[PDB]
Design an enzyme around this catalytic site. Structure first.
Site, PDB file in Angstrom:
ATOM      1  N   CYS A   1       0.818  -1.213   0.000  1.00 50.14           N
ATOM      2  CA  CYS A   1       0.000   0.000   0.000  1.00 50.14           C
ATOM      3  C   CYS A   1       0.851   1.261   0.000  1.00 50.14           C
ATOM      4  O   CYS A   1       1.649   1.474   0.922  1.00 50.14           O
ATOM      5  CB  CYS A   1      -0.900   0.036   1.230  1.00 50.14           C
ATOM      6  SG  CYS A   1      -1.894   1.548   1.292  1.00 50.14           S
TER       7      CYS A   1
ATOM      8  N   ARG B   1       0.006   4.518   2.981  1.00 49.87           N
ATOM      9  CA  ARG B   1       0.094   4.249   4.410  1.00 49.87           C
ATOM     10  C   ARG B   1       0.416   5.431   5.328  1.00 49.87           C
ATOM     11  O   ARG B   1       0.352   5.276   6.536  1.00 49.87           O
ATOM     12  CB  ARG B   1       1.083   3.106   4.680  1.00 49.87           C
ATOM     13  CG  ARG B   1       0.540   1.740   4.284  1.00 49.87           C
ATOM     14  CD  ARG B   1       1.545   0.658   4.593  1.00 49.87           C
ATOM     15  NE  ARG B   1       2.559   0.519   3.545  1.00 49.87           N
ATOM     16  CZ  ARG B   1       3.741  -0.053   3.740  1.00 49.87           C
ATOM     17  NH1 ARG B   1       4.074  -0.497   4.952  1.00 49.87           N
ATOM     18  NH2 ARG B   1       4.602  -0.159   2.733  1.00 49.87           N
TER      19      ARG B   1
ATOM     20  N   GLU C   1      -4.970   3.698 -10.653  1.00 51.02           N
ATOM     21  CA  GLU C   1      -5.701   2.441 -10.458  1.00 51.02           C
ATOM     22  C   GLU C   1      -6.883   2.368 -11.405  1.00 51.02           C
ATOM     23  O   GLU C   1      -7.239   1.290 -11.901  1.00 51.02           O
ATOM     24  CB  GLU C   1      -6.214   2.315  -9.019  1.00 51.02           C
ATOM     25  CG  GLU C   1      -5.107   2.223  -7.979  1.00 51.02           C
ATOM     26  CD  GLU C   1      -5.670   2.190  -6.577  1.00 51.02           C
ATOM     27  OE1 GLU C   1      -5.864   3.277  -5.976  1.00 51.02           O
ATOM     28  OE2 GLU C   1      -5.951   1.076  -6.080  1.00 51.02           O
TER      29      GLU C   1
END
Ligand code: HEM
Ligand code: HEM
Ligand SMILES: Cc1cc(N)nc(COc2cccc(CNCCc3cccc(F)c3)c2)c1
Ligand SMILES: Cc1cc(N)nc(COc2cccc(CNCCc3cccc(F)c3)c2)c1
Ligand SMILES: C[C@H](O)[C@H](O)[C@H]1CNc2nc(N)[nH]c(=O)c2N1
Ligand SMILES: C[C@H](O)[C@H](O)[C@H]1CNc2nc(N)[nH]c(=O)c2N1
Ligand SMILES: [Cl-]
Ligand SMILES: [Cl-]
Lengths: 362, 362
Positions: free
Chosen positions: A65, A68, A242
């Site tokens: 990730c 974070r 994404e």
């Protein structure tokens, strides 16, 4: 062996959790209580404080990730009290509403009762709470190919999609003791979607692309101190790539690059023209522009990587080891333009953490 | 221990080499000869066939190289006969000429005498035979920062650069028994360079960028059957991204993206505009266009990845294990647009191979 695994995990977690919370003097007594509870009942129950901090530590330890930096502000909703499918449904609806927050996305996790004897109390079938269906029959492809198997499972259970490219899948989950999952249609009033337009190119709207506002991963297991929360959906906001470089661009997803090239007015004939790269950039600009215009949170990969650098600095400044998966942390476009690309990361697994689990369909 | 390492490596290499060449019946006798030769002399001498195939196998085993489809057509030049610095110089000049081939680049390696007692016979100081110098004094940056330490070593030896952004470094190498390396200026007639222009944007030439035609890696060690050829420069043709996404784009290299953004007429103010990504694409289009226009070989990252897929298929079809370094194989722009990004590779080291060695400067 079962209880020993549980006890060892418990000791490690409670000690570290209580140290971080400045409550290390309470460790000894808490471990005693837990140890008795494991002896008697075969398990132990987290305090609200342990559960909240545990979920936060799990995020902080998620090697893949990039987001974070913000681990400590995770909004944790404790739904270990639910017993009915209506309660689970309403908790999932609520998660969508409160996480969405009218576009100003709040990173949130809702935690359902954990596994008992490895026996799940609640089993969520969705990969994300909000996702589009996919169909493939007789050569014809509609919607999101990644959703084909779950879409077919839903339709076996009496659901039917309209077969647009953007059918919202229903929520689908199974209760302990039930043989089949139940499914519920998502109220459209809950689901924010963003039409994709381009800041400069008017024709981009001709593609009629859209995407949903909030990615809510709902098929991973949260493990905290030896307790397995197989049902614990969580969300952040999207990083633009994404959507633009993967969901809309992958050949095994929506595969839109040729259509993008056409609307932006470039030929898609020669590899040396780098038309795929140019199309990727324009699609990714459009995604960021569109989310921003609608007032839905999103981050670009450059800002995200700058944030992750701060996470790295914060980790060292706090004396914590940093772990990461380089292969997932680099963005899928211009990775060498981020600092991530130019260093290495230890991919060790630290708990608490989020883990993959087998799909109940397939 | 020395000879045992050598003998074991020799056995493994000769067996595999001779099998691939369909000469497996000759293995037994060749090993005998080698074994005696190691006993007597402390080493053994490759046949021309072994040396050629060895260098080819070494390329084929280079985990980080996307261009390996063409391993079997490597042009191998055997210069184990050289003894003088004039001979080494002329061999290096010749390599540049024959590899360049008027722009139609031939992948070539020139192999110099190997180490004896770990004693190098020839020690090449250059990272590449053709590369630009770099300077940094008193806050002022000129040329290629990656070349700063070698540039300073050269200037210590009586060389002086003109301090343009594109000074060609001299060849610099040390002979066994000599205390200092010698240096020779590259004849400009040998060195092809390409001015960078853009197919559509006339103002791109205002940047006055150029790059050299042929990347000739000259500081790695070829290891074949236990023999260490520390001096064995080799070349291919460039993949466009190496020049456009790394050499000209990295902040610690030529750092040209802001200037690119300005000439292509976009603002470089907001991360969400993805101006770095857009600049990268246009710079990379310009690099490919310019090399093609000049008639100098180059490959784009999409074609290169398609070629590498064929290498993978060829490996399996031949019954050979495939090895690769995912982190180096993915291109630095649009990696998710290549098949490489979507699979994994075993990063095991297989010999023969090319290896890093310590720099004699620094
Ligand atoms: C706040 C905004 C966030 C951003 C921008 C962000 C960004 C990302 C991105 C880009 C990935 C790569 C996954 C892919 O390529 O599909 C990722 C993976 C991941 N993120 Fe985050 N994230 C955020 C919040 C969260 C939160 C709140 C959690 C959990 C509490 C979380 C846990 C994870 C996990 C577990 C993965 C990897 C899952 C896997 O192995 O597939 N993230 N994140
Ligand atoms: C024919 C054209 C070739 C192309 C397009 C090509 C492409 C590449 C690329 C893009 C890299 C990545 C290196 C970087 O990021 O700086 C690479 C690495 C490498 N290539 Fe190739 N290559 C070619 C020919 C060759 C040849 C002829 C050899 C040796 C005989 C070779 C051996 C290697 C090695 C050893 C590396 C990795 C070196 C390291 O660890 O830094 N390649 N190649
Ligand atoms: C919370 C959150 C926010 C944000 N912006 N992005 C994310 C993305 O995180 C995930 C989580 C789970 C899965 C994925 C998608 N990657 C596919 C994983 C996967 C593994 C193995 C096999 C597969 F088919 C697929 C992405 C998560
Ligand atoms: C033969 C050939 C053709 C072609 N198109 N490209 C290449 C690039 O191969 C190499 C070979 C050696 C080095 C590099 C550049 N990467 C830097 C390596 C490195 C490692 C460790 C520390 C460093 F400072 C630098 C690239 C080689
Ligand atoms: C630390 C990291 O591995 C480093 O930046 C690597 C990444 N992958 C790479 N890949 C290629 N082809 N070339 C490189 O120089 C690098 N650098
Ligand atoms: C095989 C390879 O590891 C796979 O394609 C990975 C690469 N890195 C990734 N990185 C992110 N962020 N997301 C992904 O889905 C993947 N897929
Ligand atoms: Cl997604
Ligand atoms: Cl280079």
């Amino acid at each position: 062996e079962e209880k020993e695994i549980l006890w060892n995990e418990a000791k490690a977690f409670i000690a570290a959790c209580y140290q971080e919370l400045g409550k290390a003097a309470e460790v000894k007594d808490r471990l005693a209580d837990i140890k008795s509870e494991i002896d008697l009942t075969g398990s132990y129950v987290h305090t609200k404080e342990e559960l909240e901090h545990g979920a936060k530590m799990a995020w902080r330890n998620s090697n893949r990730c990039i987001g974070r930096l913000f681990w400590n502000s995770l909004n944790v909703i404790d739904r270990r009290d639910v017993r009915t499918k209506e309660e689970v449904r309403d908790a999932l609806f609520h998660h969508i509403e409160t996480a969405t927050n009218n576009g100003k996305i709040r990173p949130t996790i809702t935690i359902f009762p954990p596994e008992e004897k490895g026996e799940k109390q609640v089993e969520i079938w969705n990969h994300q709470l909000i996702r589009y269906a996919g169909y493939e029959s007789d050569g014809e492809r509609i919607g999101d190919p990644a959703s084909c198997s779950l879409t077919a499972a839903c339709e076996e259970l009496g659901w039917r999609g309209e077969r647009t490219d953007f059918d919202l899948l229903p929520l689908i989950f199974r209760m302990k003791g039930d043989e089949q999952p139940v499914w519920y249609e998502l109220p459209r009033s809950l689901v924010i979607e963003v039409p994709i337009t381009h800041p400069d190119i008017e024709a981009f709207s001709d593609l009629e692309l859209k995407w949903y506002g909030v990615p809510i991963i709902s098929d991973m297991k949260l493990e905290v101190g030896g307790i397995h929360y197989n049902a614990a959906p969580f969300n952040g906001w999207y990083m633009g790539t994404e959507i633009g470089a993967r969901n809309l661009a992958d050949e095994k997803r929506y595969d839109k690059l040729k259509k993008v090239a056409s609307v932006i007015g470039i030929a898609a004939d020669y590899n040396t023209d780098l038309w795929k790269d140019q199309a990727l950039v324009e699609l990714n600009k459009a995604v960021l522009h569109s989310y921003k215009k609608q007032g839905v949170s999103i981050v670009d990969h450059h800002t995200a990587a700058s944030q992750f650098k701060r996470f790295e600095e914060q980790a060292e400044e706090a004396g914590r080891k940093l772990t990461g998966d380089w292969t997932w942390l680099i963005p899928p476009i211009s990775p060498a333009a981020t600092h991530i690309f130019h260093r290495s990361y230890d991919n060790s697994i630290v708990k608490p953490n989020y883990f993959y689990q087998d799909k109940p369909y397939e």
